[PDB]
Design a protein around this ligand. Structure first.
Ligand code: 5G6
Ligand code: 5G6
Lengths: 209, 5, 210, 7
């Protein structure tokens, strides 16, 4: 597929924004449980994901599901400084994880992240977060797709009028954010492992054990 | 569950 | 104010030495890590832009990145020895086993990409400055290391398309290194509480920031 | 702290 065609696919494969119904975590747990169903269908619509073996698909979703939930939250919370928009009817206020999420959303704001860039970063997380942990061609498949998303990201920056120096700088700035997203995810699941969790959410938690 | 979906 | 070639030379120069295991398994690793940390701190102060930071910003970056920096070093040393991890030249190994597989998978990645030492020192610099930037000068330095990485790739006769792709697959490694670190510290904190194999004083302080 | 000392 082409870059413009790749962007198009991700943009209308995009999951909807859901609404909210101890009680705080109960609401977030419920919200996350319904989002996961839409995430799975979104993942299957991510180009290259269905080409992977079924077990390889489960693994990628088990590793990245909270990352994907958090990069979504961070995106929704962009235009609302000092607050986190878990749902349009559920915006939270001022804990360490909360500060990091807020700091991440402020970074996207200051970088003025685009929706086309956002859907690429999210697809990258899906494919990359569990790409490492004989089966080597599926791994090579994911890399070639990751390379395609990379080119796609470069295309967008170049299309909007950015230097070759600015393209690689913004590329680095965005990809380094994912490191924090991974960090916020790991700290998040450490808290969730330590409010009733749903059956699907229990399975997602028993992949990080 | 995840596999079923 | 430094050039790319000056940046690279400065980082290969401040490169910490490869230590040996003073020869229970985690005891040897704990001891090895503790000695490496002393060399890491002096390496950090020689990383361009780090000394310009507040002394309280320096402590913080080290507290967040120390295990990442340790693990990316291990992964680098284990490159030419697939299926095994080279903690020390005299300590080569074959709930930590999950972390081992990830470290092994990361080193296989670097070998498959044929990571260069000049790229390695840049990545290690990036980890130090980025892993705790969230929680304007650091960004400028991070941008400088980015341009520095591009320079190295370009100088090796690599496509502009190949540069953006290699730069990407390199920075996506750091996400895994972050992951391995977070999982590692979760394990190290358990061993402290279960009072199995004692962590050193400096290593205890590094743990009490997470 | 020990970390501040070695700096
Ligand atoms: O069981 C839970 C509870 C909370 C979360 C989320 N946030 C946290 C909060 C604290 C720790 C970990 C995750 C979350 C993030 C983004 C969303 O779009 C929806 C829910 C997910 C699952
Ligand atoms: O107290 C410890 C024990 C082990 C480690 C290491 N990593 C692990 C391994 C398994 C679990 C947790 C950390 C490690 C990594 C790289 C080095 O150059 C030296 C030691 C560090 C400190």
């Amino acid at each position: 597929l082409t870059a413009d065609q790749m962007v198009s696919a991700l943009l209308d494969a995009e999951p909807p924004i859901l609404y909210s119904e101890a009680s705080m975590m109960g609401l977030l747990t419920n919200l996350a449980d319904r989002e996961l169903v839409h995430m799975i269908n979104w993942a299957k619509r991510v180009p290259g994901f269905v080409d992977l073996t079924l077990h390889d698909q489960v693994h990628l979703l088990e590793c990245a599901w909270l990352e994907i939930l958090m990069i979504g939250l961070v995106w929704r919370s962009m235009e609302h400084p000092g607050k986190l928009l878990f749902a349009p009817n559920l915006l939270l206020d001022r804990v360490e994880i909360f500060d990091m999420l807020l700091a991440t959303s402020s970074r996207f704001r200051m970088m003025n992240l685009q929706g086309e860039e956002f859907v690429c970063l999210k697809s990258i997380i899906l494919l990359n977060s569990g790409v490492y942990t004989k089966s080597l061609e599926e791994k090579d498949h994911i890399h070639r797709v990751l390379d395609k998303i990379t080119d796609t990201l470069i295309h967008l920056m170049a299309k909007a009028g950015l230097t070759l120096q600015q393209q690689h700088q913004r590329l680095a700035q965005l990809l380094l954010i994912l490191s924090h997203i991974r960090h916020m995810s790991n700290k998040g699941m450490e808290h969730l492992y330590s409010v009733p969790l749903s059956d699907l959410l229990l399975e997602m938690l028993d992949a990080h054990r | 569950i995840l596999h079923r979906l």
